[PDB]
Design a protein around this ligand. Structure first.
Ligand code: URA
Ligand code: URA
Ligand code: ZN
Ligand code: ZN
Ligand code: ZN
Lengths: 379, 375
């Protein structure tokens, strides 16, 4: 059975161009010590950036801009060495959120075209989620949607939790959700903004990137989806299908708590917001939500499976964000293996559930089957 | 026949309520002319709703109803009898003594803790308590308080929030407080209150009532605070420390794998010696120093909690009286957790008996026929 990675990223070289053109986060800079640039994407990296700008003895800010971000060859090598047959690549955070409304559409258009072209270089092994110019007007976002649905190898949309600027429960965003759903594009929801840095306290710099990445990201996703659900987006756009990064952040773990808090909320109940025919978060989880398996443990994975069903979980690696630190970056990646291992421990090696999670769900849901059969036969 | 114990259950004694009535800023209790019960306004997220109500006498009532259940011991015993609970380990609810001025704090904490002990004396064998600490006072006053509460009949631990002395639980100044409590063999019950900065919920947050702050803010705050403790080495520096985490650890069982992966892949941590081979993993800490309550409302979350800490380290709770039925006996907020246990481990199993009470009996030495706390 085929192995598909649905959570895996690239920054096209032209996108990288923009990042070193930038004076504020997100940005890429080169520092005296290493000829390997620094990728500075997150609010949490700001304090260390200012410290490294005013002090050469201070630690390097952000993360290393490796060749694994921009090189298609590196991507294919990674896939070969980790037993991945197919990747559905996507532009990584922060996408186009920082662009002015007038320029975003044209930049998104070019970058999406680049991804299509990259996928064409290895027919049958590469597909992509397109990024949208969500800092631009809604009409431009719709036009961009119509365009990407007709790009070769596009199998959905990646979007962040800020939406148009006011999150995913913004009613102005409803027509974007409708446009994407009607175009039968899967929506891959992905974190970036995390939580305000103050929540991590005054010693946060001592803990590296662990708190914003281990906690901020999945909590952001949970909050964004909970907001969507509460505003009734899933009911208003019944054909919408969303894939959630990091097994829904914390959603499978908190779904019961969310439900109990809703049914026990005085204000909601007494103002008619909790009717008897109400679709529960569990229903939405079985009907409109898919979860990636980037969860690193059979503990989280089993919760995700129990929440959405084994036919709705999809393997991913988050390549290239977690390289081995002291092991060979050209060898197998622990960050990939940990997830595959979680799958095996949870549902058993060789099982049909394993096959489903590791690739077959993605094949079915993203309609990769005809491409795959062709390739295996004709290629 | 086995004992059902509720370890997550609150009260505000009348004296404590009087203090809240007199306050001008949150936390406060405030009566409105159109309301039968006073309003309990505890959270940052309720601020905006409070101002709107202070001006416009037609805007919605702020905060939550301050029902009699908060102060009534008789209603506590009634809740227990009608929900099949033999034993409650009651605790002062958030925000405890966090808001008290430093000089007044130790005296008030001493009095309130003494009242809790006395309340437990009214129903011998059925009531124990977690004591709260005067954490706004200097650390030596806090230690003196710990030394007092250990001698109190029926006291079986300490409840505290995530702000510590004012800088969170990874604050090195807080370390001797953890040491003293652990040496006294008091279980620390970590509980949320501060939540998340309200901007994270967006401009439509008011429309969803309390759902986001309570369903997400609370457990997320718990996760962040404990993760900070772990990263700061608190669990290694205080090896005898035992902690009970509210709401099954918040999200920790679901995120433990992710935390470990982020650690081992952290370039800065690994390259500065902070990720040695002899590292005690979060998984190890979850099996050795962490207990989880079963206030999780689903067998899905409960199964993840059990897999993380073991069935011998999960404890039933209700969060009484914060989630009363709106329209209507036995509370759903209690029954949902019971049903989660039955569904996860099977009715009448020894796993069910453990989680429903026997773990708490063992860990908290819940035998009122003795004077001491049998470790
Ligand atoms: O997708 C990812 C993963 C880790 N860190 C990021 O900034 N983005
Ligand atoms: O313990 C609790 C539970 C719900 N809401 C609160 O403010 N405190
Ligand atoms: Zn990612
Ligand atoms: Zn062909
Ligand atoms: Zn509580």
């Amino acid at each position: 059975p085929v192995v598909v990675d649905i959570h895996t990223h690239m920054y096209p070289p032209s996108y990288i161009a923009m990042l070193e053109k930038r004076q504020t986060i997100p940005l890429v800079r080169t520092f005296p010590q290493a000829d390997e640039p620094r990728l500075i994407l997150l609010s949490s990296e700001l304090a260390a950036l200012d410290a490294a700008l005013a002090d050469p003895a201070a630690k390097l800010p952000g993360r290393p801009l490796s060749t694994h971000f921009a090189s298609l060859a590196q991507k294919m090598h990674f896939m070969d060495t980790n037993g991945i047959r197919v990747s559905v690549i996507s532009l990584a955070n922060p996408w186009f959120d920082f662009l002015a409304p007038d320029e975003a559409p044209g930049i998104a258009d070019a970058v999406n075209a680049e991804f299509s072209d990259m996928c064409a270089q290895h027919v049958g092994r590469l597909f992509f989620f397109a990024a949208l110019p969500l800092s631009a007007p809604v009409d431009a976002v719709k036009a961009s949607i119509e365009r990407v649905k007709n790009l070769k190898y596009c199998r959905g949309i990646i979007l962040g939790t800020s939406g148009l600027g006011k999150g995913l429960d913004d009613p102005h965003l409803l027509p974007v959700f409708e446009a994407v759903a009607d175009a039968k594009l899967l929506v891959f929801l992905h974190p970036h903004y995390g939580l305000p840095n103050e929540v991590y306290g005054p010693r946060s710099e001592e803990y590296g990137h662990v708190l914003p990445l281990a906690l901020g990201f999945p909590m952001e996703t949970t909050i964004a989806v909970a907001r969507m659900y509460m505003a009734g987006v899933f009911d208003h756009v019944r054909n919408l299908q969303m894939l959630l990064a990091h097994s829904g952040g914390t959603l499978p773990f908190l779904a019961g708590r969310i439900e109990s808090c809703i049914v026990h909320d005085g204000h909601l109940v007494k103002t008619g917001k909790v009717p008897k025919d109400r679709r529960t978060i569990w229903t939405v989880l079985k009907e409109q939500i898919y979860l990636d398996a980037v969860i690193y443990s059979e503990v989280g994975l089993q919760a995700a499976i129990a929440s959405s069903g084994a036919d709705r979980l999809m393997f991913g690696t988050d390549h290239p964000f977690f390289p081995p630190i002291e092991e060979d970056v050209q060898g197998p990646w622990d960050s990939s293996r940990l997830n595959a291992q979680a799958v095996i421990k949870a549902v058993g090696e060789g099982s049909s559930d394993a096959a489903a999670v590791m690739g077959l769900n993605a094949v079915r849901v993203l309609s990769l089957k005809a491409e795959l059969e062709h390739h295996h036969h004709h290629h």
